[PDB]
């Protein structure tokens, strides 16, 4: 005698979708030679001030012992959204430890 069954259990995907989003690039320099790049994801209304606070996570170096300079000028002002500056996808931003 027995009474036994099979089961299983599977998932699938399907569809695709991006959302809106842009890549920056940054570019980290250190006199110690200690220099890097790298590219981030933000939105195109992501604040200056997030953006500043990905650029200190990403590189280990606090925002607050740098400067970060775009189209040879600082980004001072945190309240500025990225894409009023027209930081736009592709463009790159240079900060100064």
Do not use: W
Not at 10 to 30: A, D, N, Q, W
Not at 57 to 86: C, F, K, M, W
């Amino acid at each position: 005698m027995g009474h036994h069954h099979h089961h299983h259990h599977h998932h699938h995907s399907s569809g695709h979708i991006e959302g809106r989003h842009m890549l920056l690039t940054v570019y980290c320099v250190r006199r110690d030679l200690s220099e890097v790049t790298f590219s981030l994801q933000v939105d195109a209304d992501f604040e200056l001030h997030n953006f500043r606070a990905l650029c200190e996570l990403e590189s280990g170096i606090p925002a607050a012992e740098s400067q970060i300079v775009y189209a040879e000028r600082p980004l001072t002002d945190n309240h500025r959204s990225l894409a009023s500056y027209g930081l736009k996808d592709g463009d790159v931003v240079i900060l100064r430890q």
